[PDB]
Design an enzyme around this catalytic site. Sequence first.
Site, PDB file in Angstrom:
ATOM      1  N   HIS A 163     -10.355 -39.761  88.307  1.00  0.00           N
ATOM      2  CA  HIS A 163     -10.776 -39.523  86.915  1.00  0.00           C
ATOM      3  C   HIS A 163      -9.688 -39.970  85.957  1.00  0.00           C
ATOM      4  CE1 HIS A 163      -9.026 -35.261  87.017  1.00  0.00           C
ATOM      5  NE2 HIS A 163      -8.799 -35.592  85.772  1.00  0.00           N
TER       6      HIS A 163
ATOM      7  N   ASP B 199     -12.608 -37.794  94.045  1.00  0.00           N
ATOM      8  CA  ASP B 199     -11.728 -37.890  92.838  1.00  0.00           C
ATOM      9  C   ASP B 199     -10.397 -38.488  93.338  1.00  0.00           C
ATOM     10  OD1 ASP B 199     -10.761 -35.666  90.040  1.00  0.00           O
ATOM     11  OD2 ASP B 199     -10.613 -37.867  90.412  1.00  0.00           O
TER      12      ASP B 199
ATOM     13  N   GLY C 135      -3.766 -32.416  82.107  1.00  0.00           N
ATOM     14  CA  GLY C 135      -2.572 -33.295  82.182  1.00  0.00           C
ATOM     15  C   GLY C 135      -1.948 -33.189  83.577  1.00  0.00           C
TER      16      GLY C 135
ATOM     17  N   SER D  73      -3.696 -33.192  86.287  1.00  0.00           N
ATOM     18  CA  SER D  73      -4.551 -34.004  87.175  1.00  0.00           C
ATOM     19  C   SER D  73      -3.777 -35.155  87.795  1.00  0.00           C
ATOM     20  CB  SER D  73      -5.717 -34.670  86.377  1.00  0.00           C
ATOM     21  OG  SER D  73      -6.542 -33.544  86.002  1.00  0.00           O
TER      22      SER D  73
ATOM     23  N   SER E 128      -7.318 -32.242  90.994  1.00  0.00           N
ATOM     24  CA  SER E 128      -8.589 -32.781  90.457  1.00  0.00           C
ATOM     25  C   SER E 128      -9.023 -32.004  89.217  1.00  0.00           C
ATOM     26  CB  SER E 128      -9.723 -32.675  91.536  1.00  0.00           C
ATOM     27  OG  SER E 128     -10.923 -33.166  90.863  1.00  0.00           O
TER      28      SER E 128
END
EC number: 3.4.21.12
Length: 198
Positions: free
Chosen positions: A36, A63, A141, A143, A159
């Site tokens: 993502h 992801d 942030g 992720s 994720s």
Amino acid sequence: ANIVGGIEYSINNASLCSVGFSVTRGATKGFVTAGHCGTVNATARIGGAVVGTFAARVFPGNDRAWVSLTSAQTLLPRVANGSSFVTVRGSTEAAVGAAVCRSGRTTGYQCGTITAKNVTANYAEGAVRGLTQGNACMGRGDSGGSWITSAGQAQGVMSGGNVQSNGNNCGIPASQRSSLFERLQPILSQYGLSLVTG
């Protein structure tokens, strides 16, 4: 730039994510992160400098992604823990109930335990299946950031989770947190990557 798990990088000068882990693909240097975070060919910068581009990604469904770096980048078998580092020693998957920590540019290094596996997250873009859930807190942030045991076994990349209005889930009890990560093993085999270890 020195590539360490947990540090910030930007995508196409807009969004921010966190580095997952340094990897190689033959002579090619790279890092794994969340799908993502960017689209294929999106440009990644670290400290204002271009370091590479998204080579491949899968999101939603899964992801995951990897960024192929320029030759100038220094890959390290480490994850940021404040001013210190956690050495990456391998990728043995831990079981439900194991203690685990995660590193990212928003909340730094946080620890908790693994609470469930094979969890589906329903994001705005679509469902993401097969995630592992832990109760370490995280924020927007984080992720793409590393999930690793204190013993150095890399687990996966951040994720998503139930962030609150303050942008994180650190303000609620661990019992109420759902912080989900994409398992590392499938990413490595899907892209034929080798983890950099120390």
